[PDB]
Swiss-Prot record, chain A:
Processing after translation: Sumoylation mediates kainate receptor-mediated endocytosis and regulates synaptic transmission. Sumoylation is enhanced by PIAS3 and desumoylated by SENP1. Ubiquitinated. Ubiquitination regulates the GRIK2 levels at the synapse by leading kainate receptor degradation through proteasome.
Residues of the full protein shown: 180 to 228 of 908
Tissues expressed in: Highest expression is found in the olfactory lobe, piriform cortex, dentate gyrus, hippocampus, granular cell layer of the cerebellum, and in caudate-putamen.
Subunit structure, as described in the record: Homotetramer and heterotetramer with GRIK5. Tetramers may be formed by the dimerization of dimers. Assembles into a kainate-gated homomeric channel that does not bind AMPA. Can form functional heteromeric receptors with GRIK4 and GRIK5. Can form functional heteromeric receptors with GRIK3. Interacts with DLG4. Interacts with NETO2. Interacts (via C-terminus) with KLHL17 (via kelch repeats); the interaction targets GRIK2 for degradation via ubiquitin-proteasome pathway.
Note: The postsynaptic actions of Glu are mediated by a variety of receptors that are named according to their selective agonists. This receptor binds domoate > kainate > quisqualate > glutamate. It does not bind AMPA without coexpression with GRIK5.
Name of this chain's protein: Glutamate receptor ionotropic, kainate 2
Function: Ionotropic glutamate receptor that functions as a cation-permeable ligand-gated ion channel, gated by L-glutamate and the glutamatergic agonist kainic acid. L-glutamate acts as an excitatory neurotransmitter at many synapses in the central nervous system. Binding of the excitatory neurotransmitter L-glutamate induces a conformation change, leading to the opening of the cation channel, and thereby converts the chemical signal to an electrical impulse. The receptor then desensitizes rapidly and enters a transient inactive state, characterized by the presence of bound agonist. Independent of its ionotropic glutamate receptor activity, acts as a thermoreceptor conferring sensitivity to cold temperatures. Functions in dorsal root ganglion neurons.
Length: 49, 48
């Protein structure tokens, strides 16, 4: 349901030169460490939570 | 008989649905896209 809450951001590359990646937190709340490792892998620096 | 979204912590377990689940269908769509060697694709939807 959060993609409803952020749908204008996803539609925003249709009008701007903005590149975005989209990732989902796991079902376990404590399993964020592979997600932060994947943040480390791709070297992204601008995260919207 | 129709797809609906489910709340991730809905504890009701007395329902089944024969609609094909869109995780597997989206995996099929992504595999079909990966077969066609595409790079730029535009996803057009109707309702949110």
């Amino acid at each position: 349901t959060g993609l409803i809450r952020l749908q204008e951001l996803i539609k925003a590359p249709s009008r701007y030169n903005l590149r975005l990646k989209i990732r989902q937190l796991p079902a376990d709340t404590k399993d964020a460490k592979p997600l932060l490792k994947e943040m480390k892998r791709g070297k992204e620096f601008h995260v919207i939570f | 008989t129709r797809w609906k979204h489910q709340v991730s912590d809905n504890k009701d377990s007395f329902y089944v649905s024969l609609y094909p689940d869109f995780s597997s269908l989206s995996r099929a769509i992504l595999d079909l896209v990966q077969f066609f060697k595409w790079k730029t694709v535009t996803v057009v939807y109707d309702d949110s």
